[PDB]
Amino acid sequence: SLGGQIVLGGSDPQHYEGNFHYINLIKTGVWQIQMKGVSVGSSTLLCEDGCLALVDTGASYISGSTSSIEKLMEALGAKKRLFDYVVKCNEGPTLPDISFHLGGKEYTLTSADYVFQESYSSKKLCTLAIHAMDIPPPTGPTWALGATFIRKFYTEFDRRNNRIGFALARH
């Protein structure tokens, strides 16, 4: 069991599939790209007029603004706690797909990608791998696509071209 891997100088094909799709950075300076919408199910709940997405390898979770995630969480039936959002464990597996519109594509996570399925009991609450964090100027307000996103989407950070590239991770 390999926990993960960084490649300096290239990428490892052994750990992704298909081909990289790329997105220009908005500005050199920050590993941030334009986002064109966040879906919950097949409907666009959020980020409808464009918004920003930081691609943050040193973050555990996917984060939005407090105002965005309140809305996202509304839509998931999820409950607010001091530090996290939870659902009742038995509904984790039925929770809808969440999609991130990035460049030409939808980047879709299922519930397996964002629910910590620690139980299946209705008596027990499961955490979500998505949090509210308000990031201040310059970088923020922005979403941040942390390890929750990077686990699903193998990622290349390209300095020569100031782009970021995504491939489906081979596990």
Binding site: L2, G3, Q5, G9, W31, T139, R159
Partner: protein, 162 residues
């Protein structure tokens, strides 16, 4: 150069992803997160009081065991939401995979217990841009690019699931 260098990472509970770097001569090894949301290198200092929980259980850089250490001492600060992280500039040799680079990095002498005491790793290598660097210190991948030994000016991440 046609070199690509990899670094095996540890997945702790799907919440922390970190791997190994060496700092100094001979190398002092640290667990670090490679953080495209930041641009500096920080480790705990051997000067961080044992009265910091966040320091008391991680590995500390000791400049006085290192023969390639070069002193700087410029104080530098990070504003974290739970309290301030601070220390001072040092320069030494750092090895990431097969790669060796002379690098300015920050030695931390105080940080908040939360969240840092729960970090399973010791430090951080920022993989972002000089613009976001505190004190405009040249980031490590900038220094790796300047060695001109890489195949392409890119770096990639794989994160497994637990």
């Amino acid at each position: 150069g046609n070199t690509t260098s990899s670094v095996i990472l540890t997945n702790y509970m799907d919440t922390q992803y970190y791997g190994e770097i060496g700092i100094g001569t001979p190398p002092q090894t640290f667990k670090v997160v490679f953080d495209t949301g930041s641009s500096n290198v920080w480790v705990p200092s051997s000067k961080c009081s044992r009265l910091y929980t966040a320091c008391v259980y991680h590995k500390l850089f000791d400049a006085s065991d290192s023969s390639s250490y070069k002193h700087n001492g410029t104080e530098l600060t990070l504003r974290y939401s739970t309290g301030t992280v601070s220390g001072f500039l040092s320069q030494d040799i750092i090895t990431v995979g097969g790669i060796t680079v002379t690098q300015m990095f920050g030695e931390v002498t105080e940080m908040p217990a939360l969240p840092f005491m729960l970090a399973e790793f010791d430090g951080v290598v920022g993989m972002g841009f000089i613009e976001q660097a505190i004190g405009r210190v040249t980031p490590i991948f900038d220094n790796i690019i300047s060695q001109g030994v890489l195949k392409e000016d890119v770096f990639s991440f794989y994160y497994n699931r637990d």
